[PDB]
Design a protein around this nucleic acid. Structure first.
Ligand code: BEF
Ligand code: BEF
Ligand SMILES: [Mg+2]
Ligand SMILES: [Mg+2]
Lengths: 202, 208
DNA sequence: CTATTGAGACGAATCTGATCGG
DNA sequence: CCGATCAGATTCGTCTCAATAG
């Protein structure tokens, strides 16, 4: 059958890279290419699209990025299937993204033919099973953050401050401080540096 | 006239793109596609290449990631012109990356025509510093202020802060007040081009 | 001029204690 | 129970402002 796909990446090289690879599949039609959440959300309605390809680390003055956005897309566009596609390889972040009950995750650091492997499944997941098994079978089942906790442990590595994260996600500095100091408690780290080391590696 | 190109990026979707971006240029010939800095080095002598388009942030066990690697390649593989294509948006990093005699810097956040125009400079023998790059060059650049040279104490503060120590601890630890440590930490971030603490720590990862 | 060093004012963050769900 | 969410008090850290001599 015929699907209509939206591609939402902050890097136009990767964005051209995908559309180039989705020319090969006849029944696939790329009906747009956006480079921020505000652009994605503004022209989402105007386009009849069954499925969307998005990334985690993206700019968004309004609608935010990552889990904050995936829930917002799901909320104000439930009709639309969502394929996440992230450069991030941190089990703690990924752990919370998998609960969202999205159409699938293709990793940016996975072989190129995993994206075709995703759309093949969604037409008639498998992709969302592998990581969940691997993540758990890697000895990182003791690193199961909640959505909020990941959605800070991402933004805090992006470089956004706690005051800044509270203003962007419409909570208080202390609710974020809670979710943050909670996150490190779940990971087993004490000081900002040690957290960023358990975020840099995995 | 024609050349020989290498591409090295951990994300094969980027690698798929970069390769397809140079199919548009008839006189360019793609002669390598590597993901890591271990594979890239082994096959460097085994191929006759005149240019490399490599990403800073990639996995490396034997050889480093970022500035440390570009310093090794400039040392061991000196004939080969390097263009850096990275998702990094850190003035301090990019700055220290720029001052290693690299043919040109392109960004992943930069427009798609940037890599063509960066090669168009290596076609007409010169560099392309895009809008997006120049925008970050503004941050670090000020008027004098020690010619952006860190002081003996400032250097000592960033070191400990990078070790994992807190600022109040360093105040007790280095014969002075919190004001002096904060002052000298904050002060030293203005010189390098960083603004937050996260941006500081990553610059003090590249210098390894 | 800067460098090194601060004091007081103010923000930026952590620490209890409390308030409602499956 | 713990999830998310906050309002006190209190500290960590920064900011405004300004002093030492080199
Ligand atoms: F920046 Be995304 F995680 F690909
Ligand atoms: F993440 Be890489 F530096 F492009
Ligand atoms: Mg990104
Ligand atoms: Mg990379």
């Amino acid at each position: 059958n015929n699907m209509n796909v939206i591609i939402a990446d902050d890097h136009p090289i990767v964005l051209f890279g995908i559309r180039k690879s989705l020319e090969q599949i006849e029944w696939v039609n790329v009906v747009g290419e956006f480079e921020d959440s505000t652009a994605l959300i503004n022209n989402l309605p105007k386009l009849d699209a069954h499925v969307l390809i998005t990334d985690l680390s993206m700019p968004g003055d309004k609608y935010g990025d990552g889990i904050t956005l995936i829930k917002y897309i799901k909320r104000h566009f439930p009709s639309l299937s969502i394929i996440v596609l992230t450069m991030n390889n941190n089990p703690a972040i990924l752990s919370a993204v998998l609960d969202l009950d999205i159409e699938g995750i293709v990793l940016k650091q996975g072989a190129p033919t995993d994206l075709p492997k995703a759309l093949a499944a969604l037409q008639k997941p498998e992709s969302v099973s592998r990581l969940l098994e691997k993540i758990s079978a890697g000895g990182y089942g003791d690193k199961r953050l909640s959505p909020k906790e990941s959605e800070v442990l991402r933004l805090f590595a992006e470089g956004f401050l706690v005051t800044e994260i509270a203003k962007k996600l419409n909570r208080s500095i202390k609710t974020i401080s809670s979710q943050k100091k909670s996150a490190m408690m779940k990971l087993g780290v004490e000081n900002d540096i040690a957290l960023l080391n358990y975020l840099s590696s995995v």
